Design an enzyme around this catalytic site. Sequence first.
Site, mmCIF file in Angstrom:
data_model
loop_
_atom_site.group_PDB
_atom_site.id
_atom_site.type_symbol
_atom_site.label_atom_id
_atom_site.label_comp_id
_atom_site.label_asym_id
_atom_site.label_seq_id
_atom_site.Cartn_x
_atom_site.Cartn_y
_atom_site.Cartn_z
ATOM 1 C CB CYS A 105 -0.932 0.030 1.196
ATOM 2 S SG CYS A 105 -1.756 1.621 1.380
ATOM 3 C CD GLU A 233 -5.626 0.403 -0.505
ATOM 4 O OE1 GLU A 233 -4.761 0.841 -1.293
ATOM 5 O OE2 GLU A 233 -5.576 0.525 0.738
ATOM 6 C CG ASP A 264 -1.322 -4.882 4.861
ATOM 7 O OD1 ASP A 264 -0.849 -4.184 5.784
ATOM 8 O OD2 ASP A 264 -2.010 -4.407 3.937
#
Length: 362
Positions: A105, A233, A264
């Site tokens: 991310c 996202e 993650d």
Amino acid sequence: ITLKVAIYPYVPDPARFQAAVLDQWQRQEPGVKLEFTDWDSYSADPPDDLDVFVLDSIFLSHFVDAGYLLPFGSQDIDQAEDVLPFALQGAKRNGEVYGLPQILCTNLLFYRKGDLKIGQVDNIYELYKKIGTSHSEQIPPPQNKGLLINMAGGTTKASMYLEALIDVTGQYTEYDLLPPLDPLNDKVIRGLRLLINMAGEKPSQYVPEDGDAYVRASWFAQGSGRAFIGYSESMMRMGDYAEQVRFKPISSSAGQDIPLFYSDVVSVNSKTAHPELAKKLANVMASADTVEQALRPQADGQYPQYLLPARHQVYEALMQDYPIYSELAQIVNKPSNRVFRLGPEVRTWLKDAKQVLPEALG
């Protein structure tokens, strides 16, 4: 045998991941039950009975040094060659891989199609010369005016601070040793203030009553703001509008840029009663098949989650139907990319930070 598993909760659609994982797990291990649990690495350590879980890598060093995780030998990692090198590397500690990269991310600079001028912006200072200071505290910003950015929450700010500090020093660090909160880095603080100045204090600090982490993307799609800095996202919330936006990475400094990504990773509890089965599950959860299924729309009206996969195969498979993933693949494949990691004492440093950062920022 029943395995307690926890998927990463901070995604546009957690259910798609749970369903993806269950389906893919059942294909090779139909007799092993999965008990999905709600677990957040940001506010909790791994419970003794939580076998497999996905955590934000800023917490990796802490979990590892505390003896919570079970390392993955090269034998226990499926198709390591398809995993992004920087991701796989960011999952190592003490010479061992401690997690399987599942999601990557990063904030990106979103602008509107015909806004060519914002398209040439590479850093926040260049962004400021274009949009300037917010002149309103209203939520959301006026149509086509200002910056939309989520800077609410102490850990978010603390995280932005630490990422900015890396670009400021020009040297990547996993922060085994976290930096002093006194004196704070002035350049970093000036950078964070500049962002707040562009977005507006209240708008940047806004937390919706419904806990929607993607509300600013919807505002942007509706026409609010001129620029929007948010995670990739964010595009799912944009819906049909995701195709109308343009995005590109944006640096917090003009001189040196080391693209940092939150990672993650799927890890296994050191206390698990089923080590090999757990490793097998961790792999499935991080498999290209599972992640592709989780990101893809699973019902009518759904859009791609637009999360960043850690495997090349997913970008390869998604970009046919979703050309946005071609641009995202490009960003994630930058050789200078690095995983955002924080030292073992992260939790204490985070508590200490919220007692000093909000003041420093105003």
